[PDB]
């Protein structure tokens, strides 16, 4: 942003990163409303529900 | 009127320890209908002393003989 040079000598390198199957993608979930259980008249329990 | 020593068999097992008529110990079952009778004799002015009430919880009530079955909505 500013352009100038860092006051200290930053370490850099190359390192091998692994991307994981916990992706904010399929943990997003937002109920309002919807489904409830038969017995107890209450919210359903799991996203995919 | 003398009385007899009850054992207690898991689950619901009465034993009555009388005594025959040369002097030996056998246990005698009691069977649940005769529970029930042997209850019912109890009046409502012992059963604070026996931890029970007299209009909400009789002793004879304890022996089930009218099974409630639940409401459909209960076991959908």
Same mark, same amino acid.
């Given at each position: ?49 | ?45 012992? /059963?604070?002393? $026996?931890?029970?009430? *007299?209009?909400?919880? %009789? =002793?004879?009530?304890?022996? /089930?003989?009218? $099974?409630?079955?639940? *409401?459909?909505?209960? %076991? =959908?």
């Amino acid at each position: 942003i500013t352009g100038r040079r860092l006051e200290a000598d930053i370490f850099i390198g190359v390192i091998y990163y692994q991307r994981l199957h916990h992706m904010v993608a399929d943990k997003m979930h937002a109920r309002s409303r919807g489904p409830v259980q038969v017995l107890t008249k209450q919210p359903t329990e799991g996203r995919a529900r | 009127a003398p009385q007899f020593p009850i054992k207690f068999e898991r689950p619901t097992i009465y034993w009555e320890l009388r005594k025959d008529e040369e002097g030996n110990e056998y246990k005698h079952r009691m069977m649940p209908s005769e529970v029930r009778d042997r209850l019912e004799k109890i009046p409502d002015k012992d /059963l604070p002393l $026996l931890g029970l009430h *007299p209009e909400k919880s %009789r =002793p004879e009530w304890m022996v /089930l003989t009218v $099974l409630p079955v639940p *409401p459909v909505t209960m %076991r =959908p």
